[PDB]
């Protein structure tokens, strides 16, 4: 059974893009006798918890385990001794012995010596979570971190109160990992693991080191790296047998760049892609400018894995367009706000609730004012939820400019509803054939957009046919079977 | 009896005008049934001393008491506990113990450990006053102040030895007070009552707190804040029954300032006068200037008490001129450099002995010489008392251009002393009736205060009959009876 | 037997000028019954074998004895206790207790708690000197240095690991130095001896203290300060009867400076003549400058001894010239690679052997193969011994423009050897008699030393014969017993 290792940095909740994608790929990879795991390389003391969250939300297959540097040494060092550290535990209640407890709020609590006349520590008592700042000389020396009532981590501050180094401890309440970080730059450098005796130079080094102990050097195991910041990591692994893989999410060029300057880790996986055993794209269109700039002979193009999920029944209705894309610089509806004020100018009773916080919902929403869009906009409160939320809602909007491959848009046309593209990255050339289903029209035609917008709503049983076949061409098209075939011979 | 309680910052000795005239108001409150006391809210171990010395030279009645907030809370937290705290004490014994005393003067004493080899302590033992500067690493890290053999306060400083924070102990050597300094600003931040395990976010919250606890709430209890710093805290007390009244002792307008901006304090107290039960002016014209600007309906205009002493007899003489007044920008006698110059050119003989210190007396003395006045001019060595000093002076000079009252002009008519005013600030306009009494001339007008000046001096019974009369008008104007008068009216 | 102290800062291995001349000094001073002894002021615990070895290298004679502050009030400490403080050793043993050394390399070694969590200490085992670099929330407080198994010095650093006080520690253990440092202009300020509980407002005054407490107050006994920083401190002396001289043994005019301007250091030994009892110069010429600038009457011209060795036997060959000169921006061959390239031209085959190591070497190397050199000049690995390296060599280059006196061309002239000065600082006018012995030609005069140096190497014999009688001019004018008469008449 082939061992399939997707090499991301973390793995969090409410998080979608190579995370989602991620997690899908393994449970499809599974069902062909390929073991399908996810290896992180952040510290999440809750990560138990996390991943229980995801796998009871159906966000993961309970077969997709998780390996991470911090866990494996950690069990490392609770067998190398047996008795637990009170040390620490201890030494802090005796700081805090016959001390006056100043609770600030509930949580926040400030401990003060009437005897010795100083500040001691700092306690803000989130459920299970007591984070103890230790001062001395009114000056932040450490913070502890608490998680079961045993420690985690304990943090050393600079005379600036600028994290200086971190600390990492076991089950037993034993030193396993000590790094030192740059004030400047913060940076994870001289990297100490005491459980082994061992010093590297960064967290490269010790990831690597993770990988080397973790991956055994056969070709039965293969290597995706799905983020592009852990690509170093997967360079100076010393296999020489293991197959390497990158496969690329988002578009190389970097955002609102007409310069066409490529993102500097993207650049490095592909300027260094005659190491790694290929590059997978997922548009065709990508594969041909990468292989161009940087006449790569390994760029594979197979799309990301989509569940169809089942066929709806007809969910037609009318109160609001919907965007349904997280508020992004250019990945958002920027100039899509002056195409709603247009249509206002048409249809006043048309609102406009688009889910996803950003940063750029405070300018959008102020110029939604500006364009008297105080009411005829109605941005919804990012529910978590969207399959079910807008299964009765149409004419979909999509101002994206620079789109890797439009995951949302597929899956409306599973969704049989209708999509409005601006077809300016071509992640939606694929799926959207003009007049046949959707509407791929070109980038900034608000004019364009308003017109196909108004007509999609008024003809509803003619755009419902349009979106009805769209879903048997995703469906061919993005065949899973297919898919997998074609990973397996990259793969073997 | 009517408690009223002045309130000001600091009451320190060698300190005149609210300082003198809040104890000279105390006295004549007092002798109308109406408990005069002083609300300080600076820290100052030899306070005791400090306040008896005052007494003593009869510059504050027995009667005027002096309510602090360190003070109140030590006596607080003073009978929450019993026994003596010789902890710090001893610690401070042990790590000087074995240690080489290296004296550099009589007082200042460092102690090195030649076991260790580290710098314990710097130590400069004034009388009764030993202040040890703990050293960790030749670096400040504490500054333990001792007063009656007991540690009264420690400061912790940081990288750069600037506080960052400060701790005060009552007599029985337990903390009660624990403020935290900005070392930018300089500014006390959050401050912490251990003796009552209480948090204020500022000094303004914890003066604010004492004044509630300390004042109760009836009209039997007024507030009179002379001082403009305090205002924030009288603005922020939690009484609702308390009358408060804010006393203008000075010039709202910012000094040398064409512009006409009020002082960012004074501003406020008006500004925000809508709040307080009245705002006190000296001036009449004060009143009219802030009435217009604030537009404000509590403008009183109640003049400061004045002591009358006794009567002169015919003190007679002439060997120098005088100011009589610290040096002070344009409060003090920067053009009158300039008139004494113009004089010297007529009566060479004539010399300048002005009483008082200042920043501007190094560029005045350097200008004298410069004008030629090294010895047609020699002012006084500040001698502290004036009364007698110059009883048998005449021909004062005023060349203030920001004067709030004229007290020392006020004065010298009770001296049967003539005055030469420059009625710039409209503070002599009331008291220098021109002709009839003293010599209320215009602003830089060095021509006709010269030839006014001279013939004052030439003119000796002449011009003791304008002061002799002089006294008899202050008399009837500041009446003291008449004064108090006004202020029962605005109290009640 | 007069006791003369010649007054250096240090005297370390591989170094020459000055140190050498002092050495040379000595041997002739006392060979006159007139013990030369030499005092140094910097801290070297290696200071033993760095003696011994210039003994046993024939650099020093053994009557040559060395007085430093350190040393004496050492013995002065170790006298006052009898019992080994092993405080700091032990504590410093208990805090690597049961601590996790991590060797980086074969000699950098790092310790970690793994009960604490915290980063001890830094391990660099040189050659019995381990020095451990103390640390405290992950910052340096502490560098203890090691010698003969024995603390030797301990150094507390600041905030940016910037030295703010040194330590200095005797043969029992004990504290008798504690220097205070300006981690700003790097200057030991406020200097300590607790051995005699003595303090000192700079090192200046403790070097001064220390030679009062060495250096009894007799015209017996001269003190002569060859170097230009240690003259402050023959200044400040309260001695009364000991004489005082200050040897120049360089160019007082700064370096590349055609303002004229005196370099700091000589420009007070000269202004502060006045208080000395001379000035010894070994160039008439410095003396006319130095004499007419500051106008000083205690100009006195004595030149430095120098051996005659023994008589070469006719050691004829040509391989390469050579400057065998420390490369120095003015006082090496900047120029001269000019003058190779020249040569170059005419003689391919010949080659260039400069040795002495320096900054300039870069650019120089540099400048070689750009003037197509790389082969055509080949520097020899600056190789310590040069008298019997160039004994066989001739047609030595001198291309100094700053020169203070000519040792090299002068010990050329012993070696029958001839020169090419650019007499530019009259440090050859003496030496080299144009036509008669070597060639003082003219400065930046390429052209006539390019043809100088060919005619010399092609006429063999007869540059020999200028060189020979060359060894009878040196011996005649740099007479040694002529030399000492001089510095007798001076001290005497
Ligand atoms: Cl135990
Ligand atoms: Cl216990
Ligand atoms: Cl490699
Ligand atoms: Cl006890
Ligand atoms: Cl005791
Ligand atoms: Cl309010
Ligand atoms: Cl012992
Ligand atoms: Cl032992
Ligand atoms: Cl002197």
Same mark, same amino acid.
């Given at each position: 059974?082939?061992?399939?290792?997707?090499?991301?940095?973390?793995?969090?909740?409410?998080?979608?893009?190579?995370?989602?994608?991620?997690?899908?790929?393994?449970?499809? *990879?599974?069902?062909?006798?390929?073991?399908?795991?996810?290896?992180?390389?952040?510290?999440?003391?809750?990560?138990?918890?996390?991943?229980?969250?995801?796998?009871?939300?159906?966000?993961?297959?309970?077969?997709?385990?998780?390996?991470?540097?911090?866990?494996?040494?950690?069990?490392?060092?609770?067998?190398?001794?047996?008795?637990?550290? #009170?040390?620490?535990?201890?030494?802090?209640?005796?700081?805090? =012995? @016959?001390?006056?407890?100043?609770?600030? &709020?509930?949580?926040?609590?400030?401990?003060?010596?009437?005897?010795?006349?100083?500040?001691?520590?700092?306690?803000?008592?989130?459920?299970? !979570?007591?984070? *103890? %700042?230790?001062?001395?000389? &009114?000056?932040?020396? /450490?913070?502890?971190?608490? #998680?079961?009532?045993?420690?985690?981590?304990? !943090?050393?501050?600079?005379?600036?109160?600028?994290?200086?180094?971190?600390?990492?401890?076991?089950?037993?309440?034993?030193? +396993?990992?000590?790094?030192?970080?740059?004030?400047?730059?913060?940076?994870?450098?001289?990297?100490?693991?005491?459980?082994?005796?061992?010093? *590297? =130079?960064?967290?490269?080094?010790?990831?690597?080191? *993770?990988?080397?102990?973790?991956?055994?050097?056969?070709?039965?195991?293969?290597?995706?790296?799905?983020?592009?910041?852990?690509?170093?990591?997967?360079?100076?692994?010393?296999?020489?047998?293991?197959?390497?893989?990158?496969?690329?999410?988002?578009?190389?060029?970097?955002?609102?760049?007409?310069?066409?300057?490529?993102? /500097?880790?993207?650049?490095?996986?592909?300027?260094?892609?005659?190491?790694?055993?290929?590059?997978?794209?997922?548009?065709?269109?990508?594969?041909?400018?990468?292989?161009?700039? +940087?006449?790569?002979?390994?760029?594979?193009?197979?799309?990301?894995?989509?569940?169809?999920? %089942? %066929?709806?029944? @007809?969910?037609?209705?009318?109160?609001?367009?919907?965007?349904?894309?997280?508020?992004?610089?250019?990945?958002?509806?920027? +100039?899509?706000?002056?195409?709603?004020?247009?249509?206002?100018?048409?249809? &006043?009773?048309?609102?406009?609730?688009? #889910?996803?916080?950003?940063?750029?919902?405070?300018?959008?929403?102020?110029?939604?004012?500006?364009?008297?869009?105080?009411?005829?906009?109605?941005?919804?409160? +990012?529910?978590?939820?969207?399959?079910?939320?807008?299964?009765?809602?149409?004419?979909?909007?999509?101002?994206?400019?620079?789109?890797?491959?439009?995951?949302?848009?597929?899956?409306?046309?599973?969704?049989?509803?209708?999509?409005?593209?601006? @077809?300016?990255?071509?992640?939606?050339? %694929?799926?959207?054939?003009?007049?046949?289903?959707? #509407?791929?029209?070109?980038?900034?035609?608000?004019?364009?957009?308003?017109?196909?917008?108004?007509?999609?709503?008024?003809?509803?049983?003619?755009?419902?046919?349009?979106?009805?076949?769209?879903?048997?061409?995703?469906? @061919?098209?993005?065949?899973?079977?297919?898919?997998?075939?074609?990973? =397996?011979?990259?793969?073997?």
């Amino acid at each position: 059974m082939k061992q399939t290792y997707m090499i991301v940095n973390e793995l969090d909740v409410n998080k979608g893009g190579m995370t989602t994608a991620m997690l899908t790929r393994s449970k499809f *990879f599974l069902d062909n006798e390929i073991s399908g795991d996810i290896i992180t390389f952040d510290f999440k003391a809750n990560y138990k918890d996390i991943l229980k969250e995801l796998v009871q939300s159906k966000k993961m297959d309970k077969r997709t385990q998780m390996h991470n540097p911090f866990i494996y040494f950690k069990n490392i060092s609770n067998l190398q001794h047996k008795k637990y550290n #009170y040390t620490m535990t201890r030494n802090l209640s005796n700081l805090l =012995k @016959d001390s006056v407890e100043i609770k600030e &709020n509930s949580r926040i609590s400030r401990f003060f010596n009437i005897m010795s006349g100083e500040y001691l520590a700092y306690k803000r008592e989130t459920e299970q !979570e007591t984070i *103890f %700042d230790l001062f001395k000389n &009114n000056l932040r020396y /450490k913070r502890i971190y608490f #998680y079961k009532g045993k420690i985690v981590k304990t !943090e050393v501050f600079n005379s600036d109160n600028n994290l200086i180094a971190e600390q990492f401890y076991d089950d037993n309440g034993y030193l +396993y990992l000590y790094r030192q970080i740059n004030p400047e730059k913060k940076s994870i450098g001289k990297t100490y693991l005491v459980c082994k005796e061992k010093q *590297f =130079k960064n967290n490269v080094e010790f990831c690597s080191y *993770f990988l080397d102990k973790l991956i055994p050097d056969i070709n039965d195991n293969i290597i995706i790296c799905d983020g592009p910041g852990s690509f170093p990591k997967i360079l100076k692994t010393n296999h020489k047998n293991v197959k390497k893989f990158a496969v690329i999410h988002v578009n190389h060029y970097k955002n609102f760049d007409d310069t066409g300057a490529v993102k /500097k880790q993207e650049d490095y996986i592909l300027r260094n892609a005659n190491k790694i055993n290929g590059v997978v794209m997922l548009t065709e269109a990508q594969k041909k400018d990468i292989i161009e700039k +940087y006449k790569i002979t390994n760029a594979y193009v197979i799309s990301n894995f989509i569940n169809i999920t %089942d %066929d709806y029944r @007809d969910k037609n209705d009318n109160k609001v367009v919907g965007h349904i894309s997280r508020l992004v610089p250019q990945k958002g509806l920027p +100039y899509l706000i002056d195409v709603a004020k247009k249509v206002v100018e048409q249809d &006043n009773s048309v609102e406009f609730h688009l #889910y996803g916080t950003g940063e750029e919902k405070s300018k959008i929403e102020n110029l939604i004012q500006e364009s008297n869009l105080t009411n005829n906009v109605k941005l919804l409160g +990012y529910t978590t939820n969207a399959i079910e939320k807008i299964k009765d809602f149409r004419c979909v909007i999509s101002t994206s400019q620079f789109e890797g491959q439009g995951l949302s848009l597929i899956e409306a046309m599973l969704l049989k509803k209708p999509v409005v593209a601006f @077809d300016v990255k071509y992640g939606p050339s %694929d799926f959207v054939k003009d007049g046949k289903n959707g #509407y791929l029209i070109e980038n900034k035609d608000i004019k364009k957009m308003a017109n196909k917008i108004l007509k999609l709503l008024h003809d509803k049983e003619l755009s419902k046919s349009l979106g009805k076949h769209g879903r048997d061409t995703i469906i @061919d098209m993005y065949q899973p079977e297919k898919l997998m075939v074609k990973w =397996k011979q990259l793969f073997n």
